[PDB]
Amino acid sequence: QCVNLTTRTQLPPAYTNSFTRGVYYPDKVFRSSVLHSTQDLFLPFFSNVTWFHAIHVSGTNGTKRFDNPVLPFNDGVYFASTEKSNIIRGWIFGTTLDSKTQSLLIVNNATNVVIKVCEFQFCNDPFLGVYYHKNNKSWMESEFRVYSSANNCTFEYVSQPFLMDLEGNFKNLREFVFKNIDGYFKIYSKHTPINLVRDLPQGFSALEPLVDLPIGINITRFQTLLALHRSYLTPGDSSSGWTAGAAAYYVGYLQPRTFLLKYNENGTITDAVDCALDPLSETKCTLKSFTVEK
Amino acid sequence: VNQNAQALNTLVKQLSSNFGAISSVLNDILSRLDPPEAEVQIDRLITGRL
Amino acid sequence: YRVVVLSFELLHAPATVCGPKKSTNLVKNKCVNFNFNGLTGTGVLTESNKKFLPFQQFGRDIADTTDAVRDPQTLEILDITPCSFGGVSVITPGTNTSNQVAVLYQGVNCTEVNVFQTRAGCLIGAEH
Amino acid sequence: GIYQTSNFRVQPTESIVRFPNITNLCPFGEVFNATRFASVYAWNRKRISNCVADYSVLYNSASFSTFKCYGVSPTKLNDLCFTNVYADSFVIRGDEVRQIAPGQTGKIADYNYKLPDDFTGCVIAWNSNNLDSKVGGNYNYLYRLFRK
Amino acid sequence: QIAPGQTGKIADYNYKLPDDFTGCVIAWNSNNLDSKVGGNYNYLYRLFRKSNLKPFERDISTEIYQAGSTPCNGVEGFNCYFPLQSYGFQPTNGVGYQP
Ligand SMILES: *[C@@H]1O[C@H](CO)[C@@H](O)[C@H](O)[C@H]1NC(C)=O
Ligand SMILES: *[C@@H]1O[C@H](CO)[C@@H](O)[C@H](O)[C@H]1NC(C)=O
Ligand SMILES: *[C@@H]1O[C@H](CO)[C@@H](O)[C@H](O)[C@H]1NC(C)=O
Ligand SMILES: *[C@@H]1O[C@H](CO)[C@@H](O)[C@H](O)[C@H]1NC(C)=O
Ligand SMILES: *[C@@H]1O[C@H](CO)[C@@H](O)[C@H](O)[C@H]1NC(C)=O
Ligand SMILES: *[C@@H]1O[C@H](CO)[C@@H](O)[C@H](O)[C@H]1NC(C)=O
Ligand SMILES: *[C@@H]1O[C@H](CO)[C@@H](O)[C@H](O)[C@H]1NC(C)=O
Ligand SMILES: *[C@@H]1O[C@H](CO)[C@@H](O)[C@H](O)[C@H]1NC(C)=O
């Protein structure tokens, strides 16, 4: 059963730069020491991705409320998370997000992943109430407060956790790409230790595929599931939550682009070129080479 | 040498084109379609490749 | 009478109930018809020293032919070469002198086909 | 001179097929080998999805007095991967078995469970004399004769 | 189905037509000549053969077909069926079922 939270008050949007992030392997074909051009849905290079704190302290009094905005799903989504305490737990995907239409749910607790396709009656503020045990504190018991009821379940998937245990400046970068093509929900992912970089870091990490769900549902909009360590009945003055939402998550939107990927001898995509970024990249794509002579 | 290499490379890439057929793979079209339609698709591929 | 009615749905939707995928024995180092995870082809298979990343199934170094592929049952990586082909040439003096001929097989070994192996191919019927 | 007359190839004689291990066993034993079958008005529909379905076990078991398939032949069903399959498990009298097929009438075909004229699927039943009958009479299976 | 390039029980098991046919197919309704009140089952058809027909092949074999794994030995039974079923031509049949 769900619990009502406070009004989101429509916080103004904030943007940040995505320096060469969101590149995934498009095929399952081993390619070695060659340059391949693919036209698919990628996140454009140096794009504006909108970033939200998991917990935002903005009121004069010092109110702590989850920034859990309801966000569209336009032809794929690049979802990055910089956290250190496992306060982001999963996502919900759907068109109406009520009992009328089917929807996809992904949650991650300490042991396994729960993926369900059902007609959930989600509340306005879905979340997981997280509590430690009195003696061990090694794992984190979770109370699911996402949906009031579920009916007409047509899918069920359990596997190893999507999110590693994060149990103090050891922030972690989790990068995922979600696509919904031809009735398949494709998930690409990569995990990287980060250090002293508040925003998205500069570099190249290729997203290896995780899983393809034959969900066969329509997805237009999505939301993020967060873990509440504090109490909704009694909100503390401060420090009841996790350090005023130091962790954050970034979302950018995939668009149709042609990329030139460079597979190295060991089969990994080590570099990419976005043909529509600048005239140099256009020349590189036309010549099918990373270097251009005079 | 470069030109000759290009001359071959493009040629082989022309095997991946549909030329209006359902598939650029003759074996896939046959393993799918009976003769009286696989023949039309194979004719399209033959025209393109020739 | 114990009765079960199995209603089968065939729609323009991805299939979740599927029949058995009958497979056969592996034949290595031989010219055979192969069907690996839906790729059908004709060729010989050899053991390869390539390393595939876990999400990778096939291989294309030249981007126009699948040189290597991972076997579905056993996770070994095996490559693929085309079954030896090549033109056949007849080397002849004018028939107005003799009807004896030699046969040259271009760019093939003398095992796939008074034999002389040259860089041009396998020559049969002509003395070295 | 030299003349290119023909082309040399090696035609293959044998074909090999390799597929990954058969894993996702479809629920069939829980339907056909079930200990209890519901009444003819609380009919059991069980949805079967996300599993590989072996049908030779059923069609070549010779324990089914009815194998009647409409829209599909019973021998090519192994060569198809459907979106879903609904397994309908019950018990019914023998003289009424001929009523489970599309386009038919009768107290079962009209007042229990109607099959549309455009069915695609299979009806299969087996004699449950030694499983569902008792000496004093098994009246746990209920039947309607009247509806509006 | 009586045309080249088509598939089905007759184009495969009763009359195979080659894709290169030259000639004309003619057919008309025969309700008042062939159909009887009690049904004329003098016209028999096949539902199961071992393989598809080659064009203009006329197979008149009555061997009992093997649907299962055990041999039939010319005898019906479990997964053993005669090759030919009868047609219920009746003068009250619909457009689909009249001869
Ligand atoms: C990205 O956002 C900045 C403001 O932070 C803006 O100046 C710039 O034009 C934006 N670029 C794109 C491509 O939207
Ligand atoms: C994780 O969640 C599932 C339900 O989503 C629950 O059944 C399971 O017990 C949870 N894990 C643990 C270790 O309790
Ligand atoms: C690829 O990996 C091998 C060891 O597995 C190593 O010898 C080689 O240098 C590597 N190449 C790269 C990507 O540096
Ligand atoms: C298939 O099963 C064999 C054992 O019979 C095992 O060695 C192999 O790894 C399995 N392959 C897959 C893909 O599960
Ligand atoms: C070629 O053969 C012809 C007979 O067909 C003969 O007249 C002629 O002398 C021969 N010439 C030579 C050079 O062998
Ligand atoms: C193929 O030809 C080479 C000569 O280049 C020779 O060394 C080799 O033994 C031949 N292969 C076989 C199987 O005889
Ligand atoms: C050529 O002479 C060498 C000895 O010098 C001999 O081994 C070889 O067999 C000879 N080849 C031919 C074709 O006579
Ligand atoms: C039911 O159990 C028997 C064991 O005697 C087995 O032969 C048969 O295949 C089973 N049926 C199903 C549908 O699993």
Q: What backbone torsions phi and psi does residue E31 show, to the nearest 5 degrees? A: -70, -50
Q: Please give the Cα distance from A243 to C64 (Å, whole number).
A: 54
Report the C-alpha gap between A78 and A44 in whole angstroms.
Answer: 11
Q: Which residues pair with A65 in a beta bridge?
A: A56
What is d(CA D63, CA D58) in angstroms, rounded to the nearest whole number? 8
Task: Let me know if E22 is exposed, middle or buried by CB neighbors in 10 A (0-12, 13-18, 19+).
Answer: exposed
The sign one gets for the Cα dihedral C50, C52, C57, C61 is negative
Q: Phi-psi bin for A24: left (phi > 0), alpha (psi -120 to 50), beta? A: beta
Question: Mind giving me the DSSP string for chain C?
Answer: -EEEEEEEE--SS--SEE----------SS-EEEEETTEEEEEEEEE------TT--EE-SSSSS--EEE-SSS--EEEEE----EEEEEE---TTT----EEEEET--TTT--EEEETTEEEES---
Pairing outcome for strands C39-47 and C32-36: antiparallel
Rounded to whole angstroms, the Cα distance separating D85 from A110 reads 34
> Can you read off the two tokens belonging to residue C104?
């040259």
**Nearest of A105, A6, A122 to residue A56 by alpha carbon:** A6
Max CA separation in chain B (angstroms): 44
| Rounded distance from Cα A169 to ligand 2 centre (Å) | 29
CB distance E82 to E49 below 8 Å: no
Q: Which residues of C touch B13 (CB under 8 A)?
A: 64
Identify whether the C-beta of residue A2 lies closer than 8 Å to the C-beta of residue A147.
Answer: yes
d(CA E47, CA E45): 7
Q: Do E7 and B35 touch (CB under 8 A)?
A: no
Q: Residue E82 to residues A104, D92, E67: CA-CA distances in angstroms?
A: 51, 28, 11
Q: Give residue C26 CA to ligand 4 midpoint distance, Å.
A: 14
- Please report which helix (H) or strand (E) contains residue D115, including its range: none
The CA A200 to ligand 2 mean position distance, Å, reads 32
- How far is D109 from chain E, CA to nearest CA, in Å? 22
φ, ψ of residue B49 to 5 degrees: the values are: -70, -40
Q: Is A150 in the pocket of ligand 2 (CB under 6 A)?
A: no
Whether A46 lines ligand 1, by a CB cut-off of 6 Å, is no
The alpha carbon of residue D102 is apart from the nearest alpha carbon of chain A, in Å, by: 27
In angstroms, the CA C22 to CA D22 distance is 9
Closest CA to A51 of A30, A73, A28, A79: A79
Half-sphere exposure of A42 (CA within 13 A, CB side): 28
d(CA A110, CA A89): 10
Ligand 3 proximity of A33 Cβ (cutoff 6 Å): no
Touching partners of B (3+ C-beta pairs < 8 Å): C, E
> Does residue A216 sit at the C interface (CB-CB below 8 Å)?
yes
User: Which amino acid is it at E48?
Assistant: F
- D147 CB-near residues (< 8 Å, 6+ apart): D111
Q: Are E83 and E92 in contact (CB under 8 A)?
A: no
Q: For B36, which residue in chain E has the nearest alpha carbon?
A: E5
What whole-number distance in Å separates Cα of residue D50 and Cα of residue C71? 23
Of the CA atoms within 13 Å of residue A268, those in its CB half-sphere come to 7
Distance A15 CA to ligand 1 centre (A): 8
Ligand nearest to the CA of C120: 6
Residue A15 CB less than 6 A away from ligand 1: yes
Going by alpha carbons, the residue nearest to atom 3 of ligand 3 is A266
Is the Cβ of E92 closer than 8 Å to some Cβ of chain D? no
Identify the H or E element spanning A185: strand A184-193
* Distance in angstroms (rounded) separating the CA atoms of residues D106 and D109: 5
In 3D space, the residue among A163, A49, A46 whose CA is nearest the CA of residue A111 turns out to be A163
- CB count within 10 Å of CB C104 equals 22
* Helix %, strand %, coil % of chain D (to 5): 15, 25, 60
Chain D residues in contact with A154 by the CB 8 A cut-off are 47, 49, 84
Chain C residue whose CA is closest to D63:
C2
Task: Give me the torsion for CA of D75, D79, D83, D88, rounded to 10°.
Answer: 20
The residue whose CA is least distant from atom 8 of ligand 3 is: A266
Residue A248's nearest CA partner among A69, A94, A7 is A69
Whose tokens are 């509590």? That residue is A131
Task: Say if CB D53 and CB D75 are below 8 A apart.
Answer: no
Q: Cβ contacts of residue C64 below 8 Å, gap of 6+?
A: B12, B13, B15, B16
Structure tokens at A10: 């429509």
**Cα dihedral across residues B8, B12, B17, B22: positive or negative:** positive
The single-letter code of the amino acid at D117 is D
Ligand in nearest proximity to the CA of A18: 1
**Which helix H or strand E contains D142, and what residues bound it?**
none
**CA A29, CA C70: separation in Å to the nearest integer?**
10
The Cα angle at residue B12 between residues C121 and A285, in degrees rounded to 5: 135
- B-contacting residues in C 64-103 (Cβ below 8 Å): 64
Q: Which amino acid is at A169?
A: N
Ligand 1 centre from A40 Cα, in Å?
23
Residue A87 neighbours by CB distance under 10 Å: 23
D49 by Cβ neighbours in 10 Å (0-12 / 13-18 / 19+) ranks as buried
DSSP A266: T
Strand ranges for E26-77 from DSSP E: 44-46, 65-66
**Residue B43 Ramachandran class (φ > 0 left, ψ -120 to 50 alpha, else beta):** alpha
Give me the torsion for CA of C29, C35, C37, C43, rounded to 10°.
40
Q: Cα A114 vs. chain centroid, distance in angstroms?
A: 16
Nearest to A153 by CA among A186, A114, A104, A187: A104
Contacts of E among chains (3+ CB pairs under 8 A): B, D
CA distance D2 to C90: 6
- How many Å apart are CA A185 and CA A94, to the nearest integer? 12
- Tell me how far apart the terminal alpha carbons of chain D are, to the nearest angstrom: 96
Identify all chain E residues contacting B34, using CB atoms and an 8 Å cutoff.
Answer: 5, 7
Output the six-digit token pair for C64: 């126009």
The rounded Å distance from CA C13 to ligand 1 centre is 40
Cα distances (angstroms) measured from residue A18 to each of A43, A254, C20, D67, E11: 9, 12, 46, 61, 61
Given CB atoms, is E52 within the 8 Å cutoff of chain B? no
CA distance D86 to C9: 8
The residue contributing the CA closest to ligand 2 atom 13 is A111
Backbone angles phi, psi at E30, to 5 degrees: -130, 50
Is D53 in Cβ contact with C7 (below 8 Å)? no
